Short mmCIF file of C-alpha atoms in Angstrom, two decimals:
data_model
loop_
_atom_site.label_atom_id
_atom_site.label_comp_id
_atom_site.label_asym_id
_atom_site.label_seq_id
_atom_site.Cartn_x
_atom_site.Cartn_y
_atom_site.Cartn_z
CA UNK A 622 90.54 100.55 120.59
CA UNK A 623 91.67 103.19 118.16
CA UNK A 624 92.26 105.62 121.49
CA UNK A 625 94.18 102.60 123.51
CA UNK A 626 91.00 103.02 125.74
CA UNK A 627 90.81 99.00 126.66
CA UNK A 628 88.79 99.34 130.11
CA UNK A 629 85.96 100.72 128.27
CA UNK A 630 86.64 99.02 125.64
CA UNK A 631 86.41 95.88 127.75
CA UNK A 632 82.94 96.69 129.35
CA UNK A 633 81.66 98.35 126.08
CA UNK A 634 81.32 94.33 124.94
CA UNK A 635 79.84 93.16 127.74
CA UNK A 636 76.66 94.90 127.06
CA UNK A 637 76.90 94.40 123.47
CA UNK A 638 79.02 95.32 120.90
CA UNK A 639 80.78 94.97 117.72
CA UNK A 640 82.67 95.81 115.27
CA UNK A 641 80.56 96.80 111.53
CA UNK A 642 83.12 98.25 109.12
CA UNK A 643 83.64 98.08 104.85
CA UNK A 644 86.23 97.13 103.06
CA UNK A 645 88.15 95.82 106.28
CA UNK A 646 89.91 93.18 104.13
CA UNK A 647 91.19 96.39 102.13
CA UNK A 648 91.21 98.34 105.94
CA UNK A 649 93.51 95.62 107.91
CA UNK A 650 96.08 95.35 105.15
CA UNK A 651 96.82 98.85 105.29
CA UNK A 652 97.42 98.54 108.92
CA UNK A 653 99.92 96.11 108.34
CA UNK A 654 101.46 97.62 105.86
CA UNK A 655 102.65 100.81 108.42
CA UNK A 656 103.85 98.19 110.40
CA UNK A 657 102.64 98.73 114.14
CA UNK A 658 102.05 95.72 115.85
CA UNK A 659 99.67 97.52 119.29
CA UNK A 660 96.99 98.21 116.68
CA UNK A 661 96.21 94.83 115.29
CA UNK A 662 96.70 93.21 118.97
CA UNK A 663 93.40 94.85 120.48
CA UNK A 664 91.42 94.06 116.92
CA UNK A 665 91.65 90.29 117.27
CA UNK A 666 90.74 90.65 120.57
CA UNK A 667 87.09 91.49 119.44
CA UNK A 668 86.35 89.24 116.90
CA UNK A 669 87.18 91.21 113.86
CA UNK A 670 87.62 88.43 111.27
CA UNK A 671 91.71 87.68 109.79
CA UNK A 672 90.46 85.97 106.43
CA UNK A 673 88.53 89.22 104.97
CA UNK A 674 90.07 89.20 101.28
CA UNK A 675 91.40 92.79 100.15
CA UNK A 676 90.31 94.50 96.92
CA UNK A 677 91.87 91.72 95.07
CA UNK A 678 90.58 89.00 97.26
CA UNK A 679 94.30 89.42 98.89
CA UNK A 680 94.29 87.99 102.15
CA UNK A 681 96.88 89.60 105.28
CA UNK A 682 99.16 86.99 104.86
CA UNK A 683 100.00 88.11 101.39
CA UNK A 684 101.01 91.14 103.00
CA UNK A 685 101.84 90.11 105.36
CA UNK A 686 104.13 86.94 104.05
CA UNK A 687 106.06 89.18 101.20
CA UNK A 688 107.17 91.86 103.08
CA UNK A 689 107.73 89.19 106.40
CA UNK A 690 106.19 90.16 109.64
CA UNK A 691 106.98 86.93 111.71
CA UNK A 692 106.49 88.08 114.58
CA UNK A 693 103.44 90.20 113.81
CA UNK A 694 101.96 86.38 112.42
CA UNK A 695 101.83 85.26 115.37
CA UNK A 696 98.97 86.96 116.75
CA UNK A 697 97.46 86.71 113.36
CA UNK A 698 97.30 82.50 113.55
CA UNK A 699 95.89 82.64 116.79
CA UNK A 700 92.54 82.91 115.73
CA UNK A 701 92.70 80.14 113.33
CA UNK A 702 92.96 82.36 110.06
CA UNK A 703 93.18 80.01 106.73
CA UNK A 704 96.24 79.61 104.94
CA UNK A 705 95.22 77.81 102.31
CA UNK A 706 94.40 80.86 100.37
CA UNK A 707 94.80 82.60 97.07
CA UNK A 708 96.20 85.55 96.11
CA UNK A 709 94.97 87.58 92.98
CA UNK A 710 96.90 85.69 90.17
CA UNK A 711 96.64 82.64 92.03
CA UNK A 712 99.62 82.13 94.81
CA UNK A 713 99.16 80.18 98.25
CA UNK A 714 99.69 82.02 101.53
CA UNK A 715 102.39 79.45 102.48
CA UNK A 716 103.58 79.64 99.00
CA UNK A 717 104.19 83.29 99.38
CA UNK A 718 106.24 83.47 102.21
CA UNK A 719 108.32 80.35 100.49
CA UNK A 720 108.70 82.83 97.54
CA UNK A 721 109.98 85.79 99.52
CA UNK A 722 112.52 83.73 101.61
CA UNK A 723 112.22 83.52 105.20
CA UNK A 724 113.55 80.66 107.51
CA UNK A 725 111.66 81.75 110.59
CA UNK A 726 108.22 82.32 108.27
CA UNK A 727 109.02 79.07 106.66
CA UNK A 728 108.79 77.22 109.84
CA UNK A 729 105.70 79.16 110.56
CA UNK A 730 104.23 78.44 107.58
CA UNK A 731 104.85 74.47 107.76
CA UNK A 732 103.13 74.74 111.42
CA UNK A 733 100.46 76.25 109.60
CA UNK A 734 100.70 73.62 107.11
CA UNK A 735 100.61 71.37 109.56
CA UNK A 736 97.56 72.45 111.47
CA UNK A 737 95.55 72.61 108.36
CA UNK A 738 96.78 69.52 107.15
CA UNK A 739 96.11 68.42 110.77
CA UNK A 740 92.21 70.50 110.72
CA UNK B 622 83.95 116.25 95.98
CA UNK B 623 82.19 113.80 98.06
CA UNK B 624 78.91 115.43 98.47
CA UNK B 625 78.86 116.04 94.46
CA UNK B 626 78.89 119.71 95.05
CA UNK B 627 80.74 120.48 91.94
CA UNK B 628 79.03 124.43 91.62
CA UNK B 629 81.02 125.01 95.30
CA UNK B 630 84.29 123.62 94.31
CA UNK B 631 85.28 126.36 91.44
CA UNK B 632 85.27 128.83 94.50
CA UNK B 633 87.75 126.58 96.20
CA UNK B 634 90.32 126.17 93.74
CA UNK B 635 89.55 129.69 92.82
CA UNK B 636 90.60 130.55 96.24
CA UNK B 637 93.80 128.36 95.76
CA UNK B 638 92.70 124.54 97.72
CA UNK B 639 94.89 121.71 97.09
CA UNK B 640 94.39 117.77 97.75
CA UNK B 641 96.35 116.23 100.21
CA UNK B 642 95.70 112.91 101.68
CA UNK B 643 97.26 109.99 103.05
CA UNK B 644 97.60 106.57 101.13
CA UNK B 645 96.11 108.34 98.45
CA UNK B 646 97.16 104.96 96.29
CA UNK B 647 95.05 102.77 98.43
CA UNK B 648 92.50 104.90 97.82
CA UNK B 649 92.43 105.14 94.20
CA UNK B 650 92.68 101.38 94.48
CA UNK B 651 89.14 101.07 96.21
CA UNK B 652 86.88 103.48 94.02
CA UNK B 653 87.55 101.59 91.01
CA UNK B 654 86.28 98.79 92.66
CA UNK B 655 83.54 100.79 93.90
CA UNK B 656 82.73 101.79 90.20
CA UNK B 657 81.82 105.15 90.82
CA UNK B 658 83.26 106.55 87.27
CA UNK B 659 81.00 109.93 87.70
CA UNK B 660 82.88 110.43 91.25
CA UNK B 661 85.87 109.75 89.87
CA UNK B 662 85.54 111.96 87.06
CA UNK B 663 85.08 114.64 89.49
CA UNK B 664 89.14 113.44 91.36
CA UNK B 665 90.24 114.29 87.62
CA UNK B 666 88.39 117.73 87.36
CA UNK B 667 90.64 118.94 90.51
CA UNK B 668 94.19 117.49 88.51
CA UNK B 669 94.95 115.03 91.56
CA UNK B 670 98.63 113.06 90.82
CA UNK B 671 97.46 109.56 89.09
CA UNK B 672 100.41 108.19 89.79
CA UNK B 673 100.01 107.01 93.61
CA UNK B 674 100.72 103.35 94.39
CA UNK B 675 99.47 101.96 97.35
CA UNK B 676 101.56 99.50 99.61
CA UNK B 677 101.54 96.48 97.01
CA UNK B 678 103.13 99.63 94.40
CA UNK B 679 99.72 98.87 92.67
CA UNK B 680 98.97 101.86 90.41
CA UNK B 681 95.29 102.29 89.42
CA UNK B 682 96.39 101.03 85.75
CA UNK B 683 97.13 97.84 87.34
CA UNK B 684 93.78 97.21 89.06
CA UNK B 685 91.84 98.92 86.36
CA UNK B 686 93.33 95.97 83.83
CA UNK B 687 92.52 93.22 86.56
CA UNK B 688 88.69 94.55 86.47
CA UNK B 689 88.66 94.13 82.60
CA UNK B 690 86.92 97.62 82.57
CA UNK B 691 86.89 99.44 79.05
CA UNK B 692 85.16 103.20 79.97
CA UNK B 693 87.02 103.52 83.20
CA UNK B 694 90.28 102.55 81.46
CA UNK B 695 89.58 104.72 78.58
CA UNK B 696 88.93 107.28 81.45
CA UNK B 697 91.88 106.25 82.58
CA UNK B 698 93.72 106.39 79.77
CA UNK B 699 93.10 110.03 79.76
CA UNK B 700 94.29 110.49 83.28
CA UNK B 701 97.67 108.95 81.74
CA UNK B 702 98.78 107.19 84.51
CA UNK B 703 101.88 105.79 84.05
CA UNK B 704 102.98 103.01 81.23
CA UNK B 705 103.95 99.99 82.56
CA UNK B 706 104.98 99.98 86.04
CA UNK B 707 106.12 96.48 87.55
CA UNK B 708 103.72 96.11 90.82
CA UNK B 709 104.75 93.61 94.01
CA UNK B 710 104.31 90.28 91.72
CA UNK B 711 105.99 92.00 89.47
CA UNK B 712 103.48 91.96 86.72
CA UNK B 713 103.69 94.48 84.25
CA UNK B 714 99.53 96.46 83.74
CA UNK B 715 100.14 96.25 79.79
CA UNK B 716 100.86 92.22 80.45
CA UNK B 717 97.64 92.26 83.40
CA UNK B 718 95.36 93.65 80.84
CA UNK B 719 96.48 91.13 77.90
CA UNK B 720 96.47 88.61 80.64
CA UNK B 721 92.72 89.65 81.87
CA UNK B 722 91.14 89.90 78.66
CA UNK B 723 88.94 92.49 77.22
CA UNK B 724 89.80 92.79 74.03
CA UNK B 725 87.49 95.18 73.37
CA UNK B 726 89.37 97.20 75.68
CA UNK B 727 93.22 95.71 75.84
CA UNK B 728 93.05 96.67 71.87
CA UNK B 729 92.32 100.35 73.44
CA UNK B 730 95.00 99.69 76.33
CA UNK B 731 97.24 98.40 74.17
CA UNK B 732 97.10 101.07 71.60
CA UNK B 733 97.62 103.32 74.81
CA UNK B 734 100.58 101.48 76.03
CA UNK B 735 102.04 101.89 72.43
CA UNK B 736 101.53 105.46 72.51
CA UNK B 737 102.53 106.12 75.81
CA UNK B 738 105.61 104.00 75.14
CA UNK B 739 106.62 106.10 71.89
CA UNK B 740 106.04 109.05 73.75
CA UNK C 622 127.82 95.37 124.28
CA UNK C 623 129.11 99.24 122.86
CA UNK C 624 131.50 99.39 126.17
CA UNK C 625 133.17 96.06 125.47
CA UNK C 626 131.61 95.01 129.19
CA UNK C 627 130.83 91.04 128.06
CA UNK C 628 131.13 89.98 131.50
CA UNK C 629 128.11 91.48 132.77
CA UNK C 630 126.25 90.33 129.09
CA UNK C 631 125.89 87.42 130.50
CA UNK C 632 124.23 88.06 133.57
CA UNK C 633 121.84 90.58 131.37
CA UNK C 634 121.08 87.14 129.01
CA UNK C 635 120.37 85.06 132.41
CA UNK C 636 117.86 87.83 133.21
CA UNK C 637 116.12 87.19 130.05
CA UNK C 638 116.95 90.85 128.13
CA UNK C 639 116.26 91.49 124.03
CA UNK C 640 117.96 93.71 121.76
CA UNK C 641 115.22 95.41 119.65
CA UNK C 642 116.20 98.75 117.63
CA UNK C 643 114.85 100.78 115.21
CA UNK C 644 116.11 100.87 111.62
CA UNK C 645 117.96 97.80 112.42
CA UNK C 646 119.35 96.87 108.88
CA UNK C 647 120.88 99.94 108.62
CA UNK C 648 123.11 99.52 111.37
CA UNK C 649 124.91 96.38 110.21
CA UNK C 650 125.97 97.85 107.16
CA UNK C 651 127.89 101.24 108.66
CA UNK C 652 129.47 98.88 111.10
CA UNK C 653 131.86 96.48 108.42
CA UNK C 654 132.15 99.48 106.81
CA UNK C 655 134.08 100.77 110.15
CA UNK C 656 135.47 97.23 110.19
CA UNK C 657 134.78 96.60 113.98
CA UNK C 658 135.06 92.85 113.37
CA UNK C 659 135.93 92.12 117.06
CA UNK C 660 132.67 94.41 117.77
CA UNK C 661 130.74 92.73 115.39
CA UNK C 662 131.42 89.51 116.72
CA UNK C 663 129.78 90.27 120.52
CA UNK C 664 126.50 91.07 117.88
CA UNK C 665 126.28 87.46 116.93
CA UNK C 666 126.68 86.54 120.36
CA UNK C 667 123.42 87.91 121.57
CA UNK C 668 121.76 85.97 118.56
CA UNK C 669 120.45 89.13 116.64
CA UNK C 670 118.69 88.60 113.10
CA UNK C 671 121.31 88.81 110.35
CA UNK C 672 118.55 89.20 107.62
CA UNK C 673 117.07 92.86 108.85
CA UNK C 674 117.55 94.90 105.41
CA UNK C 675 117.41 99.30 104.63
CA UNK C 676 115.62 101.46 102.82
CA UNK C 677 117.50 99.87 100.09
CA UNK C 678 116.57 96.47 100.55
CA UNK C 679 120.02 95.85 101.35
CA UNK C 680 121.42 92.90 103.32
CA UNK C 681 124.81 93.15 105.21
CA UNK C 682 125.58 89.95 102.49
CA UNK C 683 124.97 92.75 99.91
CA UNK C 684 127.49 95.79 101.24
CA UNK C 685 130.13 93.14 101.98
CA UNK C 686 129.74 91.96 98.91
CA UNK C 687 131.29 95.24 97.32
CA UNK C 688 133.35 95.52 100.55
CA UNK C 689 135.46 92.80 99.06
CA UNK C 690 135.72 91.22 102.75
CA UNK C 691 137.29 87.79 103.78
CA UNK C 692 137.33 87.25 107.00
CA UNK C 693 133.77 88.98 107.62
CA UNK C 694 132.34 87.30 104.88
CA UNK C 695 133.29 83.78 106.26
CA UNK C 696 132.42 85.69 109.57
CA UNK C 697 129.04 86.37 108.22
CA UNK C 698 128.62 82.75 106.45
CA UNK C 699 128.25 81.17 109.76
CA UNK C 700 125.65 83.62 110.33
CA UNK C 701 123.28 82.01 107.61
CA UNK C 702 121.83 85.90 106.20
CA UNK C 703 120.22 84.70 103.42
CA UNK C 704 121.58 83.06 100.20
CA UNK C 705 120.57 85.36 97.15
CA UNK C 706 118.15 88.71 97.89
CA UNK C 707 117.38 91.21 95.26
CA UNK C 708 118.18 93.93 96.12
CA UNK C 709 116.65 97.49 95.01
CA UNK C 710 119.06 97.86 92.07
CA UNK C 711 118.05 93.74 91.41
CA UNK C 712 121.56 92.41 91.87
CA UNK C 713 121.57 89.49 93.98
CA UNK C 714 124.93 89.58 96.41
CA UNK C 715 126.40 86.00 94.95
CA UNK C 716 126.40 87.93 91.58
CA UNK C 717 127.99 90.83 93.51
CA UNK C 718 130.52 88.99 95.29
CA UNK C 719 131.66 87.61 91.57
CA UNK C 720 131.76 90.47 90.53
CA UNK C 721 133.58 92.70 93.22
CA UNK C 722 136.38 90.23 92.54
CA UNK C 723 137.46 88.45 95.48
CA UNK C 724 138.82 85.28 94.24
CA UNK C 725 139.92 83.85 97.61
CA UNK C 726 136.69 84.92 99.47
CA UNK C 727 134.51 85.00 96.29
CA UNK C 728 135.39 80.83 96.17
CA UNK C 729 134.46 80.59 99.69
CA UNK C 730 131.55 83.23 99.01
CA UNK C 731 130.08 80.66 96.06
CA UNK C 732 130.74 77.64 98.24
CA UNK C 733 128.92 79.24 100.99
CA UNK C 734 126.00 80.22 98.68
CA UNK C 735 125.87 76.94 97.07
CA UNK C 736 125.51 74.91 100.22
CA UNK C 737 123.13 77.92 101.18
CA UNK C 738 121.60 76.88 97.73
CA UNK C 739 121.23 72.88 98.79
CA UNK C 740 119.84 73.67 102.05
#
């Protein structure tokens, strides 16, 4: 996946395969932070779980809500990743992109809202 | 370094070797966690910049006084990493390490913030 | 859109084209410094994102702020970019617009950021 190399990629899971990596709450969050959005598309393809917490049990949306990657939370939400979180000092997910300021986020984040209230 | 080959690396900086690696912040962020002190004593033997931040401009002071450690921070303290340098939240490591505790070692951190400060 | 060719902008629209570019903040604030009001008004038309931001964390709220602007900056009300961002020297662009000077756009400036406020 790291290579782009999908087809076999693809085939590599149908005999059996997975992903077994450390610190990959710590790992994912430093993809997002560079910003490319064709890295984390192939990851959640494979089952690599979204609600790993980071060193300080940070999840991606804190990342990912601050700085504001609305379109790269898309992807993100489609494999039902909590946002009901907390961040190190205590801060909701939802919260955070409220915090930052973010109208499109905002609206994402009261979908989310609404799904989990929803569950 | 990683191998704990210590005897080897006086040849290397002998011969004039440098470090030089990528999200170096993000690193120091991890090891901590890790709590490898006798590794990290090692990153300080070589004179590698303390001052890295990773992507949340986290500084090792500022994890270091979320752990609540008092050898590592006194290790730390020696690395003199910075003062107090406001992170993402915002949060200031002098007020994280009041704010974790330790007074055992926020007595130490604060009589290092005080010095670093009049310096 | 650069040409001035609007006629065929609309059959590009039909077709279903984006406008994605790289450093995108950037751009809007060289362009009201050229003043290419009639140029930046075929922008809005294609519905691009008003709150893209530098290196400096600067919105195009923030540069018109010190531009001292009046007809851009009730040009740029109706395009909703944020109410009050920090910028990377901290000064939010209400507080700039104050104190630019301004008084005829300033008044519609804190008008426009207090209903920006209530909403």
């Amino acid at each position: 996946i790291k290579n782009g190399n999908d087809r076999v990629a693809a085939l590599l899971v149908k005999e059996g395969a997975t992903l077994n990596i450390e610190n990959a709450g710590t790992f994912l969050c430093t993809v997002v932070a560079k910003g490319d959005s064709d890295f984390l598309k192939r990851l959640l393809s494979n089952g690599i779980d979204p609600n790993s917490k980071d060193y300080d049990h940070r999840t991606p949306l804190h990342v990912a809500a601050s700085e504001g990657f609305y379109v790269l939370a898309i992807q993100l939400v489609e494999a039902s990743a909590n946002v009901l979180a907390k961040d190190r000092w205590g801060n909701t997910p939802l919260d955070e992109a409220l915090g930052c300021g973010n109208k499109m986020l905002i609206k994402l984040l009261e979908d989310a809202k609404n799904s989990q209230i929803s569950s």
